[model samples]
Target: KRPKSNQDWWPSKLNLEILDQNARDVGPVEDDFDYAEEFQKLDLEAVKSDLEELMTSSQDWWPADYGHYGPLFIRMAWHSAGTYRTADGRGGAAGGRQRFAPINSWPDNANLDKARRLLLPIKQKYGQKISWADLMILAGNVAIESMGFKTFGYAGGREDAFEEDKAVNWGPEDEFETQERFDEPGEIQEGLGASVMGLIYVNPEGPDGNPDPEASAKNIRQTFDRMAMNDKETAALIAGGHTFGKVHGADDPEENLGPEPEAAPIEQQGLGWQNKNGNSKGGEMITAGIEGPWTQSPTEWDMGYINNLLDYEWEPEKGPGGAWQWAPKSEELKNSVPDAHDPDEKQTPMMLTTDIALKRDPDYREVMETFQENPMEFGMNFAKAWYKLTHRDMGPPERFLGPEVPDEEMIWQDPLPDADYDLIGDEEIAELKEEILDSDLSVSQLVKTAWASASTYRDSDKRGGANGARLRLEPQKNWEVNEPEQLETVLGTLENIQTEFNDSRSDGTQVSLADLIVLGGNAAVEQAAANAGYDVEIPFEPGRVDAGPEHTDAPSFDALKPKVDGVRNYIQDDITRPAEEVLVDNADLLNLTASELTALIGGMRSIGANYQDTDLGVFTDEPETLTNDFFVNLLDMGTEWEPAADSEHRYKGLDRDTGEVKWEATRIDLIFGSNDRLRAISEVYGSADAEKKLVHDFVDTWSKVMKLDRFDLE
Candidate 1:
């Protein structure tokens, strides 16, 4: 049975009225100026260039232990846009809410004031040419992309609202203060301990001053739901933003200085308070805040946050003064070192009680796990969420700048231009269909033959597609990437079909061998999906003009053949190149995105593509059906892997539940499952709830891979 939706888990008594009030407080202003003319005059390229420079430079300005301001910049962007509540269409990034009262004074905002101050110079330079709302959101995109993350689409056109138009109730209620309290001698102090600092101190009483799991979950849902975010968007926003910055703690000031000087002046730095704690034994100096980076590499965008959370055992820090937070198991921290600075010095990232709650709650946990195993899925979804976060209540795109600013680096096409077309007549298609159905080969065999024929096209020079199957069919020879036994078995079936059907002219028009090969693959996919209780429509356009022996024999029969490492599904032996790089090179040869590469592999798994006698292909659950189980199994936290005895690229997956183990993933498979660039797509397909979308995406991508070489056909 299908599980209940996220909303079902939310408490019915949630005060959605407060959410509505907060939304109106942050709504957009009337458009009085000529927005079209102003948008045209705005130099977008200049803004992008300036944003890149600022994001790159911001990281170097501070020498904090966490090492970069990129995370803070992201927070600034997030907080600015995070205010938007869809219910009343108020409180978005558009009004520059961070600059006004109430919001600027919001206690939860913490150190974001510094982030705003840092960007003042850019705003000053551009003046009214770019809106503060646009600049803030753009800064985040720039910071993310600059840090080597795959960013989603972005646009500009937010207008700043006057101070009088600002909303009165736009911030979060003091939920921390309302929770049940504990005030024992050591349990609660003047300004220290878990209770005072709002750490993991939970009350056994009512929902007041307590870290009640239900209360926290309700808070997240109501708050995000106000902003029109579903479970997926809320989880993505929290994880995506949390993946960067750290929480600042009261201990930071003492580490920087000796003790608080008697009567020394205290100063406010950004959103954190700087004051002397006279209540302490020696009147200690304190930043008086909760702080620590969320991930080991706070500057880089990756799945380390989720992976570390799942892999490492966590324990709360000891001390009355230490904020309520979890750190990695002492042994893990002792063995690990900083990626920068002192490589020998270990750094333990911290997780707030709220962060832990995401995993503890079932609804949020599902979304977190999906993204944790799939970064590509998170990146795309986060981009969409970010867009909404920044554009709430703002006028339509045409009223500001256009819908999206063109980004050449981030955008790419699957099949090159002119790759798709309808060339086969209905009569010709019917005849080919009859031939395929009449053949003695099973549906799986036909699909396997087509996959083998298409998979071999990844030459050293990368110049093969389904153009010439006849060469590989007759007298099949041994190749490095192709399993000789499997290739011969599929080749024999194709040869029989070619000899019996290709020579026969139906309706005075001969169906080329190339068309038959592509149709066969498409038929296999449709049949496989059907057998698995999925109905998928795979468009098969014919007229794939077949090539001659020249296309197959370049230098020697195997001169340009791909190395074992370069083989489609073979595990890479070279440890020098990172797994992600190896996969990128492979995808480049086929002109596919990480998403496309993952989709094509899903199709390959359905058709039985694998190394000889090994279960290492795509799907880990179902080997013969076109299902997302391949991706779901790839990212399953229950599946633990140890490197294979023979190769570094191969690993044996042990199912923690059933104790069943198998050699399942190649270097490419593991990379897609683990890498931030590709994992999200894997997660999307892996999700049981999104099976229909997965089927559509796989069919679209599989059909394109089969038609990659048919560039000349109209």
Candidate 2:
């Protein structure tokens, strides 16, 4: 499969039409069937039940040499979908091509034939009602669900491909197969030099046969990049897959301990394999060439693997057979028993040099540490990435053959409530709107001003006015958290709108200036996003009651104000400490969750808020757009930073690629990108295809922040 491009194999429109016509001519199903009705008839619940049973009911002589077949099922599903190349709509779970030649017998696929065979019985039982393509993907889905991970949204509409049709698109298989071998121990290969399939295997030694960190990293990047995965997704997939299963040594008996009355080689038997020398004690083999589980409990889905990767002391495995690997110190200590050694005892969880490299590389290490600290986040991110991985080349979810899977933990909420107010009638409201529109004021300026005032509401005291634009006017403006310059900007806009309309209103009913300010702020947010090239639907419901001066007097101001400088864009305390300490404090002050904080930041960036404290900037790209570039550039390892010569509180960021020193970041902004907890949230916003998610999240967060003072209105 060494084609210059993968697109060559994709069927043309005419080819697809011909194939469809051929199928219709041979079968009267098109005229006789109602696909929608038949899809409803599918017993999804029963299918899931059967799949779960099949996954757990392992073969006695399976890969792990036990009853667990979860790993094989995962591989089956993974490889089935892994064949997809998004550039062309070919090769995915949709075609079920694994049952055909070339793909079924591909060297890169290796022993996956056993996994397919295992599922054949179910396929036979289901017959034509369910496609083999769906079964393969479902098997992996069931395995993951059975392992106690939160999973949702799986549907089936995959169709099988004919052998003849498969032939046209099949070759180019060589691109995914390994063709090189290690020449000497610890020699590394240079450049982009590994097959996509070969990259998945944990071979630490380079093709030249040495502990090659560079080769390992390069292969990982090339393979994952081909799949359109970023560094975060790549790490998540590797860690998630390794959560269960162990490598087998049956492929090479020389690496195994003593000759055995073997039934069959693991290659034929379809099991895992490893390539490392055996450990010897007193001239007897203690550990074989095979590596064991990556976690203590390989049968479960948890953070044990990630935790161990970060916390455990690892040393190079003592072996001489092939690749480089590391074993946990705890495993070594446990296996140091006197005169008693079991094969199981020697079989300890091991890490490939690649796995170790994940921790060693500065960029990869951050993601690893993030996963180790937060497994739930890891699972959530992994599930999404895996879902995309499995569904490539397939059309939208609606094309799938089942009901939509409901997400119980949905992040997006329903639009904000549109409350009614009798404060002003249609005539008065129309007049107010006309006057405001007549004034030469841009929505961007209104939004920026409101955000500036509301942004300062966050203080150490935790009684922020983020919900209402009350601070932009009246008694609250005198508070320490409310800067005079920002107050004037916001007040100027509010006063202009009020002056333009308030004087002309002769009716007894009065329009609350506070309510108008809130409305203007919301309009600004929506307009700013739209102007910045984001089609965002922002929620805005107006019902704010302006407070009397006495209600927010000096006493209230003193209580809400901080003793320290509380209105700065960045953290005002000691800058040397982890920014999260202050960020979290501020988040708590504003009552924001990690996700909410990120969303608010995205919204703020959209309105061109003060992202930088001094000369350096926080968002170097599209400073006025509500894009994820802030989060993306912040976590980017390509950029380096140094303390500003003018002030210790600021730092200058330089892009390594272009040698452009165009941005600056405060400790607070850096914290969101660097802190493990915040970084996870940042990754979600900064994901490659997170535009919709980011916009929805930002709109929701912005709405929530805008309504902080609504309790008084209510």
Candidate 3:
């Protein structure tokens, strides 16, 4: 039996383990395997053809609905993509997260285990060429196309994670299908999209199964809004998705269903929620425990969903599974949707209480009626919304792979113009370096600006980096961490240099603001190396392009703003977590290794890159020089560190022999000696022989962060 973990012993203790939780190297695939390269070699048409065939090809274990698995596969893809919330951009189909526990076992994702199992034959056939994440989203696209609906397009490049994502905060509820997430109705707890625990979006039966359509509409709006969808998008997604599938509820799930996939017996072959009604296959299965379709032709993409919802007045009724669902009030809509298994049987079409909300809400009703009036319009809106629904969390279009990726970039992808001119060679790069260093910009300002631009690259959503030079754009340019006043001065100086260099050249060659900004950093780092008594050159590859305000989504990009930056020793006064803990998280998002974090922090501190010009972690007297002094002095036993009286997150170190205060430090500095894991890494960098290793490590990690969003490089 397992004993108490550190977190269990001390609930409030910061868990540094979570920072490296989803390490990219943990996947089951080969170390050198490149999914995008292999995906380019794939015959996407062939994949779609096979997937289309799979839709109609019924498996006796879990038969297709109305002789088509299109609806079921659509549900599988929808739920997979629907988990993405805009707040942190954590949940998405990018990692095939639905294949793992919590999500796989979600009550809302019932019977999806069978959906994935059904795709196994295809996966085995084309394992290396496509990932589960891409395949899952592509399956839905193929399903929609096969059923006479057009999709915007497909872009395959989603890499699969071998393990389940433990990073997402699913909610506070201890049990499944509970409502502990909402502060009150219409507003959900921050960063959570699901209205209840274990459910994607809102409960179909209504908020906590209350069965109120008006209240359900509020839940829908709040859920979709949190996931970055608008009223039109919300209406279209619901109307379009429901146009295909039927929710299952042949019997009560609690009474007949067994444990979920993670808890199932080995003999069941990873299958779960097996029906005890003896035969759980085909029409006998119970998912969501609420039966029937929303449209007349469940497999076809038609106006039946919008038409039926707007046309019929639905009355709340207990479904066969004892869940609240809506039925036609004035008339019997029986024999409407064909039976799932038997051709001889026909069932009445039903609406989930949430679906009824689409008609009841004024804004949603307007969207529903417009879609109801025009099938082509509805199809167009659905296809576009569906495209965004799947690809929203996949990050920039540059990361997108496959032949079907659209020719034009969508605004939401944060489009940047192509670099049509010849790239600067080593000769041009050398000249630009001298000009940048010749300017009034110091090592600190140059390094800080470059770090601000590159460090914005969070591996979470793959957004923000030196590639677009988005740091110069709105919101980013004015961020508190970037120090807008200093940022403006640095930007203006760099822009003048950029214009002069570009105007001085012709022959279809020009330097970009983006390249100049990054080059400024490279020059500064080289200068720091010289000051440290080492003659080393920092790597600089210049192909970055500048983005205009038209390319910027100011509000969306604001989410990427740095709340705390331990490298720069910056944190908000109202910081929610320990500064050091947040710093580790920052390092993790930068995709830094333990040694990288330690060395980079030490080197950055040595260069006096602290936000707002504070001298907390600047252990070195020569702050302009790149040295490992921050680590060296931090681990030094000559000083005893204690919290400073001035403010929180600050500390002062007193000389052991003499009573004088030697250095002012923040929690970020003391953490090097505090945390056992980080201390070990810090100890290595703190050693006498570590200067070369420290500087080299810092530069290596520096280039990696600067080039993180450079999907064009590979």
Per-residue lDDT of 302-324 in model 3, one digit per residue for the tens? 78888788887788888889888
How do all the candidates rank in terms of lDDT, highest first? 3, 1, 2
Q: How close is candidate 3 to the true structure, as a TM-score?
A: 0.96
lDDT value for model 3 = 0.84
Candidate 2 residue-wise lDDT, 510-549, digit = tens: 5566566656666555555665577755555545445434
Per-residue C-alpha lDDT of model 1 across residues 455-539, encoded as one tens digit per residue: 5443112235676553363222366456677666665665566566545644445555667777776777787788678887687
Q: Spell out the clash pairs found in candidate 3.
A: none
The per-residue C-alpha lDDT of model 3 at residue 294 equals 87
What's the lDDT for candidate 2? 0.55
Least well predicted 10-residue stretch by lDDT in candidate 1: 409-418
Question: Which residue segments of model 2 deviate by more than 4 Å?
Answer: 1-39, 60-65, 164-209, 251-290, 315-324, 329-346, 404-714
Backbone clashes in candidate 2 total: 14
Alpha-carbon shift of residue 401 in model 1 (angstroms) = 1.5
Stretches off by above 4 angstroms in model 1 are 1-32, 58-67, 164-167, 170-209, 212-214, 250-288, 317-321, 335-345, 400-714
TM, every model: 0.44, 0.46, 0.96
